[PDB]
Swiss-Prot record:
Taxonomy, superkingdom: Viruses
Ranges where the Macro domain occurs: 1-160
Topology within the bilayer: Peripheral membrane protein
Positions contributing to ADP-D-ribose binding: 10, 24, 32, 112-114
Protein's recorded name: Non-structural protein 3
Function: Seems to be essential for minus-strand RNAs and subgenomic 26S mRNAs synthesis. Displays mono-ADP-ribosylhydrolase activity. ADP-ribosylation is a post-translational modification that controls various processes of the host cell and the virus probably needs to revert it for optimal viral replication. Binds proteins of FXR family and sequesters them into the viral RNA replication complexes thereby inhibiting the formation of host stress granules on viral mRNAs.
PTM entry text: Phosphorylated by host on serines and threonines.
UniProt free text on domains: In the N-terminus, the macro domain displays a mono-ADP-ribosylhydrolase activity. The central part has a zinc-binding function. The C-terminus contains two approximate repeats necessary and sufficient for formation of the nsP3/FXR complex.
Subunit structure: Interacts with mRNA-capping enzyme nsP1. Interacts with host DDX1. Interacts with host DDX3. Interacts (via C-terminus) with host FXR1; this interaction inhibits the formation of host stress granules on viral mRNAs and the nsp3-FXR1 complexes bind viral RNAs and probably orchestrate the assembly of viral replication complexes. Interacts (via C-terminus) with host FXR2; this interaction inhibits the formation of host stress granules on viral mRNAs and the nsp3-FXR2 complexes bind viral RNAs and probably orchestrate the assembly of viral replication complexes.
Length: 160
């Protein structure tokens, strides 16, 4: 178990060695970041069909990226989204150790577009910490909004 760092930036600037993005069984990061990532790295636009629970890395000549399957809680029950959330985090956590990373840019999922309505970043964070507690690497979390760097700082402070 390491520390936690927050950076307000974008996926298309997440030069942390490694990036995780949503992909789902469609291969495509739901929302809009698909466009930024394409605009700077069309090589990560693999958008292959992926399995359900499995994360697959994508091998962009511009940069290596990681693509993860997030369940849509909006049309998946708590039982299946619990598993799929931990399956994503297992694929990620195993990959982190397999590749022996010290620090990784991991965004926060299930936070509007997959969740639909309820599950939040506080929760996905909790589970992301649980998976990454299993390493003594570090965890670097972004989002371009600023309220999240405040709240994540506040909780990172209360986490001492």
């Amino acid at each position: 178990a390491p520390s936690y760092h927050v950076v307000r930036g974008d996926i298309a600037t997440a030069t942390e060695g490694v990036i995780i993005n949503a992909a789902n069984s469609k291969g495509q990061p739901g929302g809009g970041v698909c466009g930024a990532l394409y605009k700077k790295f069309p090589e990560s636009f693999d958008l292959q069909p992926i399995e359900v629970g499995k994360a697959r890395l994508v091998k962009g000549a511009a940069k290596h990226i990681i693509h993860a399957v997030g369940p849509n809680f909006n049309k998946v029950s708590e039982v299946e989204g619990d598993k799929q959330l931990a399956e994503a985090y297992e694929s990620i956590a195993k990959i982190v150790n397999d590749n022996n990373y010290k620090s990784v840019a991991i965004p926060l999922l299930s936070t509007g577009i997959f969740s639909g309505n309820k599950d939040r970043l506080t929760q996905s964070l909790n589970h992301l910490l649980t998976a990454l507690d299993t390493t003594d690497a570090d965890v670097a979390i972004y989002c371009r909004d600023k309220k999240w760097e405040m709240t994540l700082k506040e909780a990172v402070a209360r986490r001492e």
